Structure formats: C-alpha cells, structure tokens
Amino acid sequence: HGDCQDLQKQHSDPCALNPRMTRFSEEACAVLTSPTFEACHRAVSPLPYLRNCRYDVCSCSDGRECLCG
Amino acid sequence: STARCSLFGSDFVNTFDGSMYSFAGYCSYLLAGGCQKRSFSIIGDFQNGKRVSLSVYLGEFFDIHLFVNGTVTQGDQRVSMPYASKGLYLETEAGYYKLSGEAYGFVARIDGSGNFQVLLSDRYFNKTCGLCGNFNIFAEDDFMTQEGTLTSDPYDFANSWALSSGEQWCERASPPSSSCLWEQCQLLKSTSVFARCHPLVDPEPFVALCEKTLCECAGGLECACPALLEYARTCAQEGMVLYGWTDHSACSPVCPAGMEYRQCVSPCARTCQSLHINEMCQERCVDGCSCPEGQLLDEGLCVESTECPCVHSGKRYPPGTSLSRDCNTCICRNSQWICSNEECPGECLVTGQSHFKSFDNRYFTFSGICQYLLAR
Amino acid sequence: GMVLYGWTDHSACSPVCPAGMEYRQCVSPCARTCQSLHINEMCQERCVDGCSCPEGQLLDEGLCVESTE
Amino acid sequence: GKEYAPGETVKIGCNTCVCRDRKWNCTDHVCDATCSTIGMAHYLTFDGLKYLFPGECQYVLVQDYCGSNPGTFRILVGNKGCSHPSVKCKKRVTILVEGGEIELFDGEVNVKRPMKDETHFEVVESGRYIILLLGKALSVVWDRHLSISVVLKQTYQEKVCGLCGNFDGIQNNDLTSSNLQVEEDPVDFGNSWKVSSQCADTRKVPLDSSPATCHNNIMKQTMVDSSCRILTSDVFQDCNKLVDPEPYLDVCIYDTCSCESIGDCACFCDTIAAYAHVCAQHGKVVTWRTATLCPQSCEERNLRENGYECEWRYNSCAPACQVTCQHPEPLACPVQCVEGCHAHCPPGKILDELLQTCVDPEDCPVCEVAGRRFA
Amino acid sequence: SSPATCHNNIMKQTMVDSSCRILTSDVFQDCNKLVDPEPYLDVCIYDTCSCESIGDCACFCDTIAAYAHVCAQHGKVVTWRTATLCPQSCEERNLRENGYECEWRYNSCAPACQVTCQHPEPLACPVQCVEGCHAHCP
Ligand SMILES: *[C@@H]1O[C@H](CO)[C@@H](O[C@@H]2O[C@H](CO)[C@@H](O[C@@H]3O[C@H](CO)[C@@H](O)[C@H](O)[C@@H]3O)[C@H](O)[C@H]2NC(C)=O)[C@H](O)[C@H]1NC(C)=O
Ligand SMILES: *[C@@H]1O[C@H](CO)[C@@H](O)[C@H](O)[C@H]1NC(C)=O
Ligand SMILES: *[C@@H]1O[C@H](CO)[C@@H](O)[C@H](O)[C@H]1NC(C)=O
Ligand SMILES: *[C@@H]1O[C@H](CO)[C@@H](O)[C@H](O)[C@H]1NC(C)=O
Ligand SMILES: *[C@@H]1O[C@H](CO)[C@@H](O)[C@H](O)[C@H]1NC(C)=O
Ligand SMILES: [Ca+2]
Ligand SMILES: [Ca+2]
C-alpha cells in the first residue's frame, strides 16, 4: 500500500527514553547467560536472543509478559 | 530566555506556554526532555494522586532522587545535603531545595508545599517533548501524544508519557468521578494589587481552577490561596514583579523558622562564615524566605550576630572557648581566633632503619655508613 | 546625632502601642493616608520613633485598613 | 658533588655566589615566586609546599584583601566537576583587578568590564600558552587546559593570602586558614577559602596512595608506575641533579589511576609537560616527545591555500615574546622558554597579527590614538 | 556484553559508548549508507573496556582508522584526525640539517604505489588509498 509512510532510521536502544526501566531489563534478561540454560549454550548461541529480551522489556508496556514471552 | 512549568495546587498542571489543566496519576510521568536525542530526563513521581518525590536521569548511569520532605538518594544509597557531584549541585536557597544543572541547563525547586518548578533555556526551543508540553510561542497545539498525533482530552494525552520500571507496572488513569461559601477568587479581578499583571496575562483560567477548588473546600481558607501564589509567580517571571501583595488576604506560604516570606531576596544570603566578597551577586529576584535583618544564618537556624561560633578542624566552639595547643593557646572572638606567637621546644628524632626528623619538621632518609655529626 | 539602626532584634521587651505594633525608627511624621492630597516635598522633619502598620495599609481615624476600603 | 677552584663563581637562579676561604660568600635578593596548579588536584604554594585538595566550587587562589591595608587584586579559581580527576574536568578563572573580569574559560580571554588602566594591559599568544600582564608585578601564565601559574615580584612580600600562602620565606606557617588559625591537614584548610557558603565541603579521603581506582588490579598499578617512570629515564637525568622528581612522580601516580582515559591522552602528557616546564626555568631545556609517546603537530594551521611555504615548526622552548605590529617593543614576559609551535621567519618580513602569515612591516597601525588596532 | 571490566562502573560504560559513537557523527554519515557501522561499534566497545590506557592511545584510534580504511575502499574518503582527537605528525623526519624545505605532508589517503629508482613501472597494489604521511615532490 503506497500510502504507508516509509520509516527512517531504526533505533536500537528503546530505554534511552524510559530510563526508569534500565536496571530491570539488564537484571532480568540475564538468565540466558546463566547455568540454568548451560546445556543449550552449545546448541544455539544465545546472542540474538539476549538483545531481543532487552529490547522487548525496555520497549513494551507490560514487561511482565514481555519477559516470559 | 527561560520558561517555567510548574506542578501545584492539588492535581494541577501548567506548561511552558500557558495552557493549563489538571491530572492525577500513578506512574512517574515524563516532565521534560528532548525526544530526538534525549541526553537527560526529568521524571515526576506520584503516589495515589499525590506528588511524592522528584528525580532526574543523566544518560543511563546516574539517578538522584529528591523527595518532598527533603531526603535525597542515589538510586540505592542515602546521601547527605548539600552533595555536589558530576554536575548537578543540590543545595538550599531562600528555604527551598534547589537542584541546579548548568552544564545541561535547568534548575528545579521544591518548596514547603511540595510545588515543583523547572526553568529551561533557549537552546531547547521547539525541542522539548514531555508532559510540560513543547516549547514554542504558539500556545494552542501543546497536547502532542508520544505517537506524534494531537488530541483534546487531557487524560488521553497525558497517559502516553507514563514510565514503568520493572517492579512498578502502572495502569490507565481515569478522572475522579466526585463532584461537589464565599467567592474570594475574584480578588484577582477587583483589587488593584494584581491590576498591573492584567495586560500581560489573562486572569480567567486561574479563576476557573479557583472555583474548581472551591467545589472541594475541605477547609476554611485553603480554598483559594494555592491558586493565588501561582499567578503571582507567573506574572513575576513575565517581566514585572508584584510588590507587597499577601498583605490583604493570603495564607502565609510556609517555611520553617523566621517565616520572613518576601519577594526579591538575594540568593547569596550573607552569613558570617563568609569572606564578604561583594559585587559577585548578579542573580535576579527570587521569592522565598529568610529571617529578619538583625540576624545572620547558621546551618540549622539563624542566630544574633554576636554569637557566630569559631571553627577548628570542622568542630564548632562557643565564643570565649580558648583551645590549647602544646606551645600556645588563644581565644575565639567573633569567628576570629587570635593567638600569640611564642617559641616552643624542638625535638630531633632518629628511629627506624635510617629515618631522621629535623628540628623543625623535615622528614627524610639518609643511610650512610660512617660517623656523622648530629648536633652542636 | 547617630540614631541606632535595627536594634530590638536581640533582647528588647517590645515597647507597647495599641495597633500594628510596627515599632521602628526613622518614620516620617507626615503619616500618609488616603484622606489627603498626596502633597510631597513638605516632609522635612527629623527621624522620630513610633508605631504604624505594615506598608500596604493606610491609617484611618481608629485603625488602618487595606487600600481597597 | 664537584670541585670548585677558589675565586670561581656560580649563579643559582637569581643570585651569584663565589668562593672565599672555603666558605661561600654571596648576596641576597628576594626575587619573584610562582604559585601553580601541578596537574588537576594538587597545588604548590609560593614557598614550595605541595598539598592535595580536590574540590568542586569557587575558591580563592590569591588575593590581598586580608591584611591591614586596602586590597588591590583577587583571582578566583572555581572549577567545574573536578572533585574527581576524570576527563570531563573543566576549570574557570576570574580576575578582578580594578573594575573588570577576564574569564579564562575554553578558548580565550574576555574583557567583560574594561579596566580604566589599560596602560599596562597586554595579552600574548606564544607557543601553546597565553600570557597576561596585569600590572608592574602581577602576571598570569595559562596552558589553555588545566595549569594556571602566577608570578609576583618582590613588592608583594608578606601581603597576600589564599590557597597559595602568604609569601614571606617560611614554609611552616604558610598553611593558615581564613580565620587566622593554622590547620593540620590540607582538606580542612581549604574549605575556609570557599566563596559561596553552600558547596558541601569535601570530606576527606582516608585511604593511602594508589586510590581506590587502583590497588584492586596491581596489573594496572604496575603499569602506571613504569609508564611514567620516564621522569628519570634518559633525558631527565640532567634535570634530576637540579630538581628532584619526588613530588611530580607522586602527582603522576595520582590522576592516572583515577582517570579513565579513552581516546584522549591529555590526562598523562600534561604532568610530564609540567616537569619539563620547571626544568626549563633552570636552563636545562629537554626534548622528550617521540612518534609513539604523546605526539604533537602544528602543521594543520599552515595556509591550506598553498601550504608549500611551511611557516610553522615545533621547537624545544621557542623564546617567549616576539615583537610584531602589536607591541613593537620588548615586554617583561617572565618565562622566556615557552615550549610550543613557533614561527621562525627571516629577519625581514616579521609575523602578522590576525591571519598568521609573516608580512613586510607596512601592515602596522597608522596611529596609537585611543589604543585601537587601526589595521 | 561489557566484559567484567565494564558493567561494574557504568560511569565508564556510559563514557565509552559516547567516546566512540563518533562513527555516526558527521563525517561518516556518507559511509553509513554504503557500509553499516554496526559490527565496528561492537569492536570499539570491546578492547576499550578491557584496555586501560596510560600515556598510549593507539588502543582506540586503530578501530576508527580500520573503519575509515573500509570506507575509502568504497571511494568515500574521509578526514577525521584533529588536534584533540588522535593527533598525528610526520615532520620529525624532515632533514633536520636545514628543515625549511618541507617535502612531507599528511594527505587523505595518499595513493599507494609511486615509481622511483626501485621499480620504474606500475605495480598491482590492491589498496591504492593508503592513508598516511606522504611526499608530494614536483
Ligand atoms: C520522606 O519520604 C520518604 C518516602 O515517602 C521516606 O522514605 C521512607 O522511609 C521509610 C522509613 O525507613 C522506609 O521504610 C523502610 O523500608 C525498608 C526497606 O523496605 C524496610 O526494611 C524498613 O523496615 C522500613 O519499612 C521507606 O522504604 C522509605 N521510602 C523510600 C526511601 O522511598 C523518608 O523517610 C521521608 N523522610 C523522613 C525524614 O521521614
Ligand atoms: C519546529 O520544528 C519543526 C521541524 O524542525 C518545524 O516544522 C516547525 O515549523 C518548528 N516550529 C516553529 C514554531 O518554529
Ligand atoms: C662578602 O664580601 C663582601 C665584599 O666582597 C664583604 O663586604 C662581606 O662582608 C662578605 N661577607 C662574608 C660573609 O664574608
Ligand atoms: C628554537 O629556536 C631557537 C631560536 O630561534 C633556535 O636557536 C633553536 O635551534 C630552535 N630549536 C629547534 C629544534 O629548531
Ligand atoms: C592528496 O593527493 C592528491 C593527489 O596528489 C591531491 O590531488 C590531493 O589534493 C591531496 N590531498 C591533500 C589534502 O593535500
Ligand atoms: Ca507550544
Ligand atoms: Ca610564608
């Protein structure tokens, strides 16, 4: 559809706009690099899945279900 | 060039341009900060529809929380006052708690009533974003939601700025559904005390909120006076300060002792532990308080000029409280110790492996192997 | 010849006068009120101690009332 | 250390001494002194005392409104956010001589209130420094980043006060506070010269050397000591006879542990620059900058239109004040050995004022009336 | 991210992000269209947390120079070295006997291979845009 506006520069850090929730995002989205998941670290690299968690929690309104999503 | 937005009354708001309304929330809304390159943010914490605490945020590393009862923190610590740090001087002023940032540009107070004030600068023109609205002279289109669209409902506009952090999740805000004898609000429309602020601002909206508050009137004279300070401060900042109001019906804005509320006090506020440098107080009039004229201020309260205590090593001593050195001693006058010189014995120590101490005090190490002459 | 300035702030016992209680030094005896012609240049009297009421109130025969009344 | 045949002389900075009957006989001449900021937390009084005092508001460097005489000048050295020696540090200096301020901040000088006695008011830009002359005796030398120095000739003897002592020739009592009491440690001494009474005086650092940013690595503590042990390495072995590198080393250990530098190396080159500057005042010019150790260039401002006329070079210490169509007569610049980048044009075609290109002497002012440039 | 050297200060991890966010500042904006500055940012954040510099600053300028090297291969030469950001000089080797004849200058990328009495014929130098200090004799 040609009436949709083309987005300009994508923005990487969403919690540069909500600095209240910076400690919680880093603290919570850290189980992925922890011995709870240690078996799976050799099957799929948890690199993209960590920054996805950080972005999801900093950005979305209800971070309780964005964390476990 | 410097504007002013304030949060006052009980559940009221004013912006950088004038369009002013009400809102009572729960979720630490965003009061100011540019929304293309953020680089700092003022966040206003509420609780149960009230106003508790105030906080800044630099980048993503440094916090500071200021609170309404004068207690200050660090994010998880409990710092004292004044506490200068990486920029951001917390202080006190004519009785109110000031947070000054001049590298970035803003100054924020909290008075005894818990009313907030923040003054921005000219380089944020057409770039501010938060709940205090954008900063352009045109005063009507100042309800841009975070999406960028424009609305008309105060609540739908102001719910788009709430900020949540981890443990604290917040809900949607709904206007309170509670409706409702003298009309002293027109005191802005009759007396000639305020008559000179008329050609700069329009006194209608203040009367509007004043009757809104008159609806409640959970008290005798609390109905109107919080609606009256703000108009004074606004037309004071507008270019001409009112002189000698509060002499007719006002409700005596509170500060602890002395209570000498007055306009045009010098923020320098001469005390007696000072160097009496003149000429270097080029600051505008600020309302506030002080304590009469014949007294000088101490850190806690203010005392008569005859009793400024002296200081040695950070201790405080009452006048006429001579301390004793080994060699001499002298007496505290009005913050001016006056000792008399006198030669006192000297010692030349020689200890350790090879560690000397001269007769005056010079310490050193020599370590040579022979016989030497130590004194004569 | 040298009038004392700003005492009474330390230990005095507040010399008594009926209303206002604004005891102060160097007050003009002209005592401006609203029932007058606001004629200036004819207040050539030396300092006199006495009483008045703040600044925003003008004196009537009994007491002083705000300028509006 | 060395032999000296009878009748031979020696000069020490300011005075000359000669040998007479196995004892040195020589003359006395109280001459000028210098109070300076060694680095960015340490001070050096007029009689040569070193102390540590990190603060963050406006203080008093040196004034003379304290004795039983009418004051003249006053220099205030309020610094911004330098309670910790990080790279974000910035400093400001305000000078109140007769009726003006000068505001040394960032780029250059201001004149925010003209002085009625510009008859001896000069500003000179030589090397990498700026030199201010404010009267018969008073001078100020500025690095443009963080080191401020002040020179007073013998007239102001025993007549000033501040964070620089009272200049009488005794070290012991030159640590007195503003209320006529001799303190013990520098931290409670320096709170008394604070201008505004709402600063939150600095408390005290209880620990010993190697501040907390160090001693938790000793992989970083043992690189810093060797990295700036070049104060004794090979070029400074002639300096070390005349001035001892005991205090400057201890400056370098500080504000290098406590200074997280990322792409800006100025936190380290400036201490070595200070020590080298002090050597130059004793006639021991040194060269210490390599291609891999705090390198410096001055070819950027070299007339990009053509540029082949290479009119700029980096010299050892480049004698200080050179005449031009600005002050066509020698001045009294108390430095004479300014390190920096220098212009060495031939005897004719002296250097200009504004465009930084040597030109023939025609472009001098037409007249000196009203003290204007007049092209 | 932020090795154990970082995330224990975040007065240094907030000082090293903005210290080398200059890859998107004003000069490299031409490159950002043709090569994205995403992997080189992650290169810069690393080995600056874990690289304590005292008097030597090559640990940081080299990343920026590598990214500039990448850009110039795409015909988008840039100039980023100032007097207060990774300064460089080359006039030390300028014939100290006289010195007034300046034959060395610092150019943008100083095209690589020039003929002399070493190989009087063009070579195959697959860079041709070597930044450095250069000699521009007639
Ligand atoms: C000014 O207001 C603030 C908040 O309105 C007051 O801070 C609050 O102080 C109480 C008293 O200590 C704190 O309660 C304590 O919390 C800890 C941690 O949960 C708990 O272990 C204790 O048993 C106690 O319940 C409360 O957390 C704290 N709220 C904050 C810091 O947000 C402050 O005391 C007031 N000032 C004065 C002078 O009272
Ligand atoms: C504010 O900025 C926008 C975009 O830069 C511009 O379109 C608008 O006209 C500006 N408003 C004013 C009042 O200058
Ligand atoms: C030094 O020499 C001068 C003249 O040569 C003489 O007047 C003076 O007394 C001498 N002083 C000493 C200490 O020998
Ligand atoms: C510095 O300048 C002086 C005077 O012009 C000169 O004698 C000296 O050789 C110069 N130093 C260098 C390294 O060129
Ligand atoms: C770099 O060299 C080229 C070719 O010699 C020249 O055209 C260009 O002007 C030079 N750049 C600078 C900044 O001198
Ligand atoms: Ca607006
Ligand atoms: Ca002395």
mmCIF file of N, CA, C and O in Angstrom, chain B residues 133-166:
data_model
loop_
_atom_site.group_PDB
_atom_site.id
_atom_site.type_symbol
_atom_site.label_atom_id
_atom_site.label_comp_id
_atom_site.label_asym_id
_atom_site.label_seq_id
_atom_site.Cartn_x
_atom_site.Cartn_y
_atom_site.Cartn_z
ATOM 1 N N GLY B 133 4.780 19.818 27.842
ATOM 2 C CA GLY B 133 4.458 20.283 26.509
ATOM 3 C C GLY B 133 5.654 20.829 25.761
ATOM 4 O O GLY B 133 6.733 21.016 26.306
ATOM 5 N N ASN B 134 5.457 21.074 24.469
ATOM 6 C CA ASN B 134 6.553 21.589 23.668
ATOM 7 C C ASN B 134 6.738 23.085 23.913
ATOM 8 O O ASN B 134 5.856 23.779 24.429
ATOM 9 N N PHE B 135 7.908 23.585 23.531
ATOM 10 C CA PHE B 135 8.348 24.937 23.851
ATOM 11 C C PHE B 135 8.434 25.733 22.561
ATOM 12 O O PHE B 135 9.515 25.925 22.005
ATOM 13 N N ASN B 136 7.283 26.193 22.088
ATOM 14 C CA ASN B 136 7.197 27.175 21.019
ATOM 15 C C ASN B 136 6.161 28.202 21.439
ATOM 16 O O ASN B 136 5.284 27.922 22.252
ATOM 17 N N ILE B 137 6.269 29.415 20.894
ATOM 18 C CA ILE B 137 5.451 30.506 21.402
ATOM 19 C C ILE B 137 3.965 30.258 21.172
ATOM 20 O O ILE B 137 3.141 30.623 22.015
ATOM 21 N N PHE B 138 3.597 29.620 20.066
ATOM 22 C CA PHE B 138 2.203 29.308 19.779
ATOM 23 C C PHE B 138 1.698 28.355 20.857
ATOM 24 O O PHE B 138 2.241 27.260 21.030
ATOM 25 N N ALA B 139 0.656 28.757 21.575
ATOM 26 C CA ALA B 139 0.316 28.136 22.845
ATOM 27 C C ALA B 139 -0.857 27.172 22.785
ATOM 28 O O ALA B 139 -1.322 26.738 23.842
ATOM 29 N N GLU B 140 -1.347 26.815 21.597
ATOM 30 C CA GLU B 140 -2.586 26.049 21.492
ATOM 31 C C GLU B 140 -2.397 24.575 21.157
ATOM 32 O O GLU B 140 -3.208 23.751 21.589
ATOM 33 N N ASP B 141 -1.347 24.215 20.425
ATOM 34 C CA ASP B 141 -1.169 22.850 19.936
ATOM 35 C C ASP B 141 -0.270 22.035 20.848
ATOM 36 O O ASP B 141 0.514 21.208 20.381
ATOM 37 N N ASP B 142 -0.363 22.251 22.155
ATOM 38 C CA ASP B 142 0.569 21.672 23.116
ATOM 39 C C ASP B 142 0.005 20.436 23.791
ATOM 40 O O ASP B 142 0.131 20.279 25.005
ATOM 41 N N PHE B 143 -0.651 19.561 23.034
ATOM 42 C CA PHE B 143 -1.074 18.253 23.515
ATOM 43 C C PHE B 143 -0.603 17.115 22.616
ATOM 44 O O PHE B 143 -1.343 16.164 22.376
ATOM 45 N N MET B 144 0.629 17.152 22.129
ATOM 46 C CA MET B 144 1.079 16.090 21.239
ATOM 47 C C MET B 144 1.406 14.841 22.044
ATOM 48 O O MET B 144 2.289 14.865 22.905
ATOM 49 N N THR B 145 0.693 13.752 21.760
ATOM 50 C CA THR B 145 0.941 12.473 22.400
ATOM 51 C C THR B 145 2.298 11.941 21.969
ATOM 52 O O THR B 145 2.977 12.516 21.121
ATOM 53 N N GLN B 146 2.708 10.822 22.554
ATOM 54 C CA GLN B 146 4.010 10.284 22.194
ATOM 55 C C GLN B 146 4.018 9.758 20.766
ATOM 56 O O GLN B 146 5.081 9.671 20.149
ATOM 57 N N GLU B 147 2.846 9.427 20.217
ATOM 58 C CA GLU B 147 2.779 8.987 18.829
ATOM 59 C C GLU B 147 3.125 10.113 17.878
ATOM 60 O O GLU B 147 3.549 9.861 16.748
ATOM 61 N N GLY B 148 2.953 11.350 18.310
ATOM 62 C CA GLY B 148 3.096 12.495 17.448
ATOM 63 C C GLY B 148 1.790 13.118 17.018
ATOM 64 O O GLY B 148 1.801 14.233 16.485
ATOM 65 N N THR B 149 0.673 12.442 17.243
ATOM 66 C CA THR B 149 -0.625 12.984 16.894
ATOM 67 C C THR B 149 -1.079 13.987 17.949
ATOM 68 O O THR B 149 -0.484 14.113 19.017
ATOM 69 N N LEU B 150 -2.145 14.712 17.641
ATOM 70 C CA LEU B 150 -2.654 15.765 18.507
ATOM 71 C C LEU B 150 -4.065 15.422 18.956
ATOM 72 O O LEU B 150 -4.860 14.885 18.181
ATOM 73 N N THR B 151 -4.374 15.723 20.215
ATOM 74 C CA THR B 151 -5.647 15.320 20.795
ATOM 75 C C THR B 151 -6.308 16.472 21.545
ATOM 76 O O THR B 151 -5.913 17.630 21.380
ATOM 77 N N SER B 152 -7.337 16.175 22.342
ATOM 78 C CA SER B 152 -8.044 17.208 23.092
ATOM 79 C C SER B 152 -8.296 16.810 24.541
ATOM 80 O O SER B 152 -8.412 17.676 25.409
ATOM 81 N N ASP B 153 -8.402 15.524 24.816
ATOM 82 C CA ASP B 153 -8.627 15.069 26.185
ATOM 83 C C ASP B 153 -7.335 15.172 26.983
ATOM 84 O O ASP B 153 -6.305 14.653 26.544
ATOM 85 N N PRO B 154 -7.333 15.846 28.137
ATOM 86 C CA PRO B 154 -6.106 15.881 28.944
ATOM 87 C C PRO B 154 -5.613 14.506 29.341
ATOM 88 O O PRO B 154 -4.401 14.254 29.328
ATOM 89 N N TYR B 155 -6.522 13.597 29.678
ATOM 90 C CA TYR B 155 -6.109 12.301 30.194
ATOM 91 C C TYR B 155 -5.542 11.416 29.093
ATOM 92 O O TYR B 155 -4.528 10.737 29.294
ATOM 93 N N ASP B 156 -6.185 11.409 27.928
ATOM 94 C CA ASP B 156 -5.672 10.629 26.812
ATOM 95 C C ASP B 156 -4.320 11.143 26.361
ATOM 96 O O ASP B 156 -3.480 10.364 25.909
ATOM 97 N N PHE B 157 -4.095 12.444 26.466
ATOM 98 C CA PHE B 157 -2.794 12.989 26.126
ATOM 99 C C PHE B 157 -1.754 12.581 27.151
ATOM 100 O O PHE B 157 -0.682 12.099 26.792
ATOM 101 N N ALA B 158 -2.065 12.739 28.430
ATOM 102 C CA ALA B 158 -1.057 12.624 29.468
ATOM 103 C C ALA B 158 -0.810 11.203 29.910
ATOM 104 O O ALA B 158 0.114 10.974 30.684
ATOM 105 N N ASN B 159 -1.622 10.253 29.477
ATOM 106 C CA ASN B 159 -1.333 8.863 29.785
ATOM 107 C C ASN B 159 -0.313 8.249 28.844
ATOM 108 O O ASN B 159 0.127 7.128 29.089
ATOM 109 N N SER B 160 0.061 8.938 27.778
ATOM 110 C CA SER B 160 1.010 8.410 26.821
ATOM 111 C C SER B 160 2.441 8.627 27.229
ATOM 112 O O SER B 160 3.333 8.209 26.499
ATOM 113 N N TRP B 161 2.679 9.273 28.365
ATOM 114 C CA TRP B 161 4.015 9.579 28.838
ATOM 115 C C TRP B 161 4.422 8.815 30.075
ATOM 116 O O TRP B 161 5.575 8.918 30.473
ATOM 117 N N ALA B 162 3.550 8.022 30.658
ATOM 118 C CA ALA B 162 3.900 7.315 31.876
ATOM 119 C C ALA B 162 5.055 6.354 31.644
ATOM 120 O O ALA B 162 5.175 5.751 30.576
ATOM 121 N N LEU B 163 5.898 6.193 32.662
ATOM 122 C CA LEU B 163 7.106 5.391 32.558
ATOM 123 C C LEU B 163 7.103 4.334 33.651
ATOM 124 O O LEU B 163 6.894 4.655 34.824
ATOM 125 N N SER B 164 7.335 3.084 33.279
ATOM 126 C CA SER B 164 7.309 1.975 34.216
ATOM 127 C C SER B 164 8.678 1.334 34.308
ATOM 128 O O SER B 164 9.405 1.266 33.322
ATOM 129 N N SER B 165 9.023 0.841 35.491
ATOM 130 C CA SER B 165 10.354 0.284 35.715
ATOM 131 C C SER B 165 10.236 -1.017 36.495
ATOM 132 O O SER B 165 10.164 -0.995 37.722
ATOM 133 N N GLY B 166 10.250 -2.139 35.788
ATOM 134 C CA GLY B 166 10.436 -3.414 36.445
ATOM 135 C C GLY B 166 9.362 -3.766 37.443
ATOM 136 O O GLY B 166 8.283 -4.231 37.070
#
